[PDB]
Amino acid sequence: FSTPEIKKVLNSDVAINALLSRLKQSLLTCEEFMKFIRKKYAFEEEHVQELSKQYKHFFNIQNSSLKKMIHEVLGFDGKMAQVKQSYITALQKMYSEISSLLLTMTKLRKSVKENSKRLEKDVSDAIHSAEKAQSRYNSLCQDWDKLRKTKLTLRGSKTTKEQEEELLRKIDNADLEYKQKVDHSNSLRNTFITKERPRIVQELKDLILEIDTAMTIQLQKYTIWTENLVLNTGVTISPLDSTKSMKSFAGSVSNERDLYSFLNKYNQLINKNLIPVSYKKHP
Amino acid sequence: DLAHLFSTPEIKKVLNSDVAIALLSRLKQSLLTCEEFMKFIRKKYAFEEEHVQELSKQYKHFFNINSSLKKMIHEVLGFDGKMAQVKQSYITALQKMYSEISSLLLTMTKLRKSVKENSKRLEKDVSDAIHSAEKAQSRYNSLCQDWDKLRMTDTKLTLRGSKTTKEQEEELLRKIDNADLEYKQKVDHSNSLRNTFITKERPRIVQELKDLILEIDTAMTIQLQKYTIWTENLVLNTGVTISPLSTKSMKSFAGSVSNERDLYSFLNKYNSLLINKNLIPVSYKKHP
Ligand SMILES: O=P(O)(O)O[C@H]1[C@H](OP(=O)(O)O)[C@@H](OP(=O)(O)O)[C@H](OP(=O)(O)O)[C@@H](OP(=O)(O)O)[C@H]1OP(=O)(O)O
Numbered sequence: 312f313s314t315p316e317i318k319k320v321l322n323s324d325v326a327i328n329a330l331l332s333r334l335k336q337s338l339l340t341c342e343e344f345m346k347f348i349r350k351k352y353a354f355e356e357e358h359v360q361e362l363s364k365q366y367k368h369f370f371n372i373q374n375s376s377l378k379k380m381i382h383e384v385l386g387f388d389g390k391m392a393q394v395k396q397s398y399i400t401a402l403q404k405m406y407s408e409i410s411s412l413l414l415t416m417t418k419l420r421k422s423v424k425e426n427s428k429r430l431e432k433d434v435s436d437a438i439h440s441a442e443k444a445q446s447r448y449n450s451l452c453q454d455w456d457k458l459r460k461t462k463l464t465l466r467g468s469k470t471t472k473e474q475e476e477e478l479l480r481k482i483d484n485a486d487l488e489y490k491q492k493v494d495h496s497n498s499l500r501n502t503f504i505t506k507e508r509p510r511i512v513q514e515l516k517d518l519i520l521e522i523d524t525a526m527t528i529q530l531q532k533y534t535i536w537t538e539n540l541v542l543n544t545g546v547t548i549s550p551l552d553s554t555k556s557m558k559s560f561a562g563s564v565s566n567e568r569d570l571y572s573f574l575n576k577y578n579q580l581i582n583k584n585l586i587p588v589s590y591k592k593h594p
Numbered sequence: 595d596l597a598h599l600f601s602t603p604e605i606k607k608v609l610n611s612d613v614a615i616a617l618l619s620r621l622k623q624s625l626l627t628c629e630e631f632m633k634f635i636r637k638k639y640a641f642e643e644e645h646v647q648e649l650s651k652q653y654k655h656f657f658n659i660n661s662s663l664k665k666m667i668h669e670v671l672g673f674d675g676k677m678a679q680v681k682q683s684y685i686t687a688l689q690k691m692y693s694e695i696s697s698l699l700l701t702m703t704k705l706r707k708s709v710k711e712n713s714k715r716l717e718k719d720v721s722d723a724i725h726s727a728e729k730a731q732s733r734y735n736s737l738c739q740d741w742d743k744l745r746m747t748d749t750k751l752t753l754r755g756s757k758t759t760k761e762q763e764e765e766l767l768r769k770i771d772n773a774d775l776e777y778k779q780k781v782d783h784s785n786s787l788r789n790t791f792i793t794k795e796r797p798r799i800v801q802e803l804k805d806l807i808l809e810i811d812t813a814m815t816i817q818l819q820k821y822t823i824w825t826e827n828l829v830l831n832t833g834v835t836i837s838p839l840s841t842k843s844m845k846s847f848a849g850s851v852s853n854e855r856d857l858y859s860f861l862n863k864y865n866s867l868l869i870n871k872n873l874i875p876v877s878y879k880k881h882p
């Protein structure tokens with residue numbers, strides 16, 4: 312946390328590009344997680360839908376124990392589905408949230424990067440202009456230096472004198488623009504290095520940490536949602552109140568009693584021919 | 595208490611008319627219960643199969659790869675994988691159950707067919723005997739009618755030899771005696787067959803049908819319980835999958851993340867170093 316090393320590296324040039332790249336990576340993690348969650352909640356939603364639909368067929372009709380018990384365990388199926396529905400709802404909510412996040416953060420990063428590029432460019436090209444002017448100045452001065460040696464004469468005439476004077480004026484002007492452009496460039500540069508740069512990298516750091524922490528929280532949420540789902544279905548099938556368990560329903564059937572019911576019911580008939588033949592004569 | 599089927603209404607019900615042999619229908623109903631259940635669990639393991647497939651396929655389809663997060667997400671997706679595995683096991687169990695119930699249904703159907711046909715056949719035999727008796731009766735009564743109509747005639751007719759009323763009388767008397775013996779015989783035959791059917795065979799048939807019904811239904815109930823334990827196993831196993839009996843749980847992964855530390859690593863890692871040629875400052879130095 313703000314070590315001499317970290318503070319040392321944060322002061323260099325590559326920093327501003329580096330943590331931009333980092334932030335980009337973070338954005339990518341976000342988008343990735345979005346996609347995953349979407350696919351997940353999609354097919355899970357599918358699962359729920361069929362789960363809920365399918366059990367409502369079969370034995371849905373309203374007189375026997377077994378059929379009833381089956382009806383009930385299919386009911387359990389339904390309950391499970393409702394739980395999972397709650398879960399997918401949670402997932403959807405999450406997705407929307409992290410989407411909004413990603414949007415905001417991408418936009419923000421774009422802005423910061425633009426600003427950075429602009430400022431840095433301004434400084435750099437200012438320096439460029441300065442060093443150009445420098446080159447000019449040094450060139451003219453180099454010629455004037457070339458003036459002053461294995462040479463002949465020359466007292467010269469009005470022409471050479473005029474050339475000298477003119478060149479001196481030229482060098483004077485070039486010198487002034489040189490100096491002022493240098494001071495300008497250095498001013499801008501130092502203003503950038505001392506104030507703007509650390510502010511930008513500060514902002515980018517803050518952003519990265521923000522989005523990272525948010526997403527990690529989101530991951531933890533996904534986790535607790537999942538284990539919530541699993542646990543609750545787990546306690547849905549086996550509520551710890553045994554009378555509500557699935558095995559509880561499946562346990563109580565008694566077919567013999569239902570058969571006795573069938574027959575004893577049939578008691579409360581049918582001739583079917585097979586009436587015997589009687590023998591009697593008539594003399 | 596057992597011997598509920600040994601009660602008065604029950605015994606008189608089964609010992610009653612063909613209404614007993616109701617049991618065929620009931621066995622049919624149980625068979626339809628079987629088939630319906632099959633249909634259901636078929637649909638079930640179908641869409642569960644779909645779910646599992648998509649689970650595994652989708653889980654494996656993303657990261658596959660350096661910060662903490664990437665790792666952690668990779669892990670929780672791994673957990674998704676484990677879940678897919680256990681649910682696959684569950685599906686396998688379901689399919690097995692399907693096969694078993696199917697075989698059961700087959701057996702029971704074949705048996706029902708056989709028994710029913712047998713019953714029908716024996717009943718038919720009885721009915722045929724009765725019919726024969728009725729025929730003999732008709733013949734006898736007819737010939738008696740002929741006699742009683744004949745003795746209203748006062749004269750001789752020529753046929754075999756020739757004449758007469760008296761001889762015709764005696765002849766017809768002989769005929770009717772024969773027809774009468776036939777009658778009595780076939781009556782006794784009929785009634786004997788009937789009694790033997792009612793007292794011996796029919797009970798055995800009823801017994802068999804009842805036994806079959808209880809067999810299939812009990813079997814299907816234990817099957818239901820099997821399905822229940824299968825589901826319990828599934829959910830319990832996914833449960834213990836995502837939270838093992840450890841430091842390698844899901845909450846453990848999701849909980850433990852670097853963020854600040856590995857960012858410090860990321861920065862301190864940059865330490866030769868790229869310095870910008872565009873931002874080299876410029877100095878002003880004059881010239882003599
Ligand atoms: O077209 P490319 O050669 O593949 O380069 C692009 C481009 O970067 P440059 O402008 O420096 O060439 C994008 O910049 P923009 O068009 O959006 O202004 C930049 O996007 P970011 O500035 O938002 O980072 C993107 O990077 P990324 O793929 O992380 O989005 C990067 O692609 P490369 O990193 O593969 O070079």
Ligand SMILES: O=P(O)(O)O[C@H]1[C@H](OP(=O)(O)O)[C@@H](OP(=O)(O)O)[C@H](OP(=O)(O)O)[C@@H](OP(=O)(O)O)[C@H]1OP(=O)(O)O
Nearest residue numbers: 618619620621622623625703705706707708709710711714
């Ligand atoms: O009890 P099952 O062994 O399954 O046989 C029944 C029975 O036929 P049988 O009396 O010849 O044994 C039905 O007859 P009823 O009880 O209605 O008098 C008949 O119904 P239909 O006479 O109306 O055709 C039905 O046939 P289906 O399933 O087409 O309705 C047929 O079942 P099977 O064709 O499977 O033998």
